[PDB]
Paper text:
Analysis of 600 fragment-soaked hSR crystals revealed 44 interesting binding events, of which twelve had displaced Tyr 121 from the core of the small domain in at least one of the four subunits in the asymmetric unit. One of these is a 1.53 Å crystal structure of hSR bound to compound 1-x0495. In the hSR XChem structure bound to compound 1-x0495, the compound is observed in subunits A, B and D, but not in the subunit C. A superposition of the 1-x0495 structure with the 1.6 Å malonate/ATP structure shows the Tyr 121 sidechains occupying similar positions in both structures. The twelve XChem compounds binding to the Tyr 121 region exploit a naturally occurring pocket. Before the small domain can move to enclose the substrate (or malonate), Tyr 121 needs to be expelled from the core of the small domain so that it can adopt the ‘closed’ catalytic hSR conformation.
Human serine racemase (hSR) catalyses racemisation of L-serine to D-serine, the latter of which is a co-agonist of the NMDA subtype of glutamate receptors that are important in synaptic plasticity, learning and memory. In mammals, D-serine is synthesised by a pyridoxal-5′-phosphate (PLP)-containing enzyme serine racemase (SR). The first mammalian structures of SR, published in 201031, revealed a dimeric structure with each subunit consisting of a small domain (residues 78–153) and a large domain (residues 4–67 and 156–316).
Residue numbers in the entry:
A (entry chain AAA): 4 to 325
B (entry chain CCC): 3 to 319
Write the structure that this text describes.
Amino acid sequence: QYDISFADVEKAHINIRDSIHLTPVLTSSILNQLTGRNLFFKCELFQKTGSFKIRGALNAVRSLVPDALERKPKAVVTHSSGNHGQALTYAAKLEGIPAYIVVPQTAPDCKKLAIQAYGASIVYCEPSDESRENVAKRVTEETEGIMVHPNQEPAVIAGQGTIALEVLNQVPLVDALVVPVGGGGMLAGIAITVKALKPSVKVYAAEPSNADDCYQSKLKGKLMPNLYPPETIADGVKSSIGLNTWPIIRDLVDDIFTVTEDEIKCATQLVWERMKLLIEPTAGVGVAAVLSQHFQTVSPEVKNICIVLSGGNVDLTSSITW
Amino acid sequence: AQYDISFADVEKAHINIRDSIHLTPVLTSSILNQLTGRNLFFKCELFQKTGSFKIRGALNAVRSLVPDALERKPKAVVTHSSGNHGQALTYAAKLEGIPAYIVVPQTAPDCKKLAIQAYGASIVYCEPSDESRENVAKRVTEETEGIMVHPNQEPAVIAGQGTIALEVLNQVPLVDALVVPVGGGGMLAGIAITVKALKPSVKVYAAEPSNADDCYQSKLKGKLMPNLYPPETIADGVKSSIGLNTWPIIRDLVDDIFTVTEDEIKCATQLVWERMKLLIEPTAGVGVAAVLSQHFQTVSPEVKNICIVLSGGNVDL
Ligand SMILES: *Cc1c(COP(=O)(O)O)cnc(C)c1O
Ligand SMILES: *Cc1c(COP(=O)(O)O)cnc(C)c1O
Ligand SMILES: CC(=O)NCCc1ccccc1C
Ligand SMILES: [Ca+2]
Ligand SMILES: [Ca+2]
Ligand code: NA
Ligand code: NA
Ligand code: NA
Ligand code: NA
Ligand code: NA
Ligand code: NA
């Protein structure tokens, strides 16, 4: 019915489990007191590469074919220069194949250097999408690689869904999962998984109000991407949902909660100070959601809530003051 | 053997406190394993209630010690500390439904006073001298039918800290060594008593700043050699010297002491933030720095499974 099935999520977890961490679920008395709820924190900030994106990236590397005539990818290519690019480079290294990141000339110098230091090759493009696409397609074809989209690629979505297999196993009495949403690869993967296994468990999305396409899409009942590039401290959720994740989100996600920039900042600081976990602000989005006024509308029966702390890739010097 | 505590006291403390403290997780790190050549296990006391292990000793003391009064239960706690110790004692007081008073010089800055009140301590003012601090604390303790609790030499505190090792031995059955930051040595002594009672083949190693190397010097000389003057170190939590109660335990039951430079502490603390995403305070970086140090590299390869106590996460941000 959708672009992935629960079977694909299980194939993904078989494919990746030898190379990822079964990350712990931690608790906090303090956050329990603040929210009214029994919270559980799925600690993907401790995952290999610093975020959950290694799940989808490694599944893609281990499951996708470059061509009808070649079963083994000979390179990986992406336009992601964030957590996805980092994860994809790690996955490529594991599999002994080169990684190429397509990067606009306008990218910051510090980022160009970091990409290279981590062991990816940079291929430069113009800031234009026309050039970006020309360059990446060319790289993919010439290197016999796989292009791996950060959120719309079925193998990626399936890999991210493995988070939910772990959460359900780790928290048998869980009532809901709260998931930050950008392109919706993680949300969609989780939603497929939870609804296949235990549909009584709620799946809630958490999104910046400054980048509220998932909320607006669910509201309108059709895919409504951000018209303009969003401004938000939650740098990891600036992507809009897309054609492959939207149908899953429309049908299988129970509710969306939007949170202000101040709410994201305060929740992130709370996690830092009271939980001693170095989450990136993007991973504070789910925490802000459960703390938010609108979350009070969630039935009191929904008691045990697992929040995905999706990443810990923060630059400390910059995060001294926002 | 005989010391100010035995393992029996640690077992008592465990029963006294377990219902109110977190059994903190033990986490691992591939990169730190790769840097050290060992199998490392991180006992996450930074996730303990109040942000450090000190709630263990503090709660044990509040539930053990008696005031100089008719009634057996303390009616308040009184402290000089606005740090990990005082914050622990304050939380213990809240659990027991009694006020926590902190004696503060009248001249203290407004920001410090606000910080103190935030965690729920009640300020009583004194004059800015050691004489006035002592005398005000004595008065308040007596008038409120309260107790005071030494941060590292109090037997009830030493016994409480030992509970760290009780958990570690359960969580890491094949552990070969514990690495423990040492200041006053309440934590080191409690842990040493516990380990040597339960599984004496397991090594107990201390870690301290080379800028505050009284433990190392004391073990070398075979006698208590306190820091001659208050040390300067980023590891704010281990500025105290070992004392008369913890020294004999450390002398007899601690296998070795590793010293680490300020740069090593800072770098280890950064490595843990960046690579482990754990907001340890620099004092908790001391034990990590120890296991990364050149001296530790030479430790027998048989000592493979090493548990480092990440003692606290109370850092100013
Ligand atoms: C990518 C990412 C997300 C969102 O994932 P999508 O599949 O794009 O919705 C959330 N948090 C972090 C840290 C991420 O890196
Ligand atoms: C108090 C403290 C120590 C040292 O404990 P002692 O019993 O004084 O040796 C170490 N780390 C932290 C975080 C502390 O608060
Ligand atoms: C902030 C920064 O430098 N991000 C780059 C992340 C990245 C992307 C692709 C490959 C490798 C890395 C480190
Ligand atoms: Ca969005
Ligand atoms: Ca010392
Ligand atoms: Na192809
Ligand atoms: Na599973
Ligand atoms: Na239920
Ligand atoms: Na589709
Ligand atoms: Na003080
Ligand atoms: Na005693």
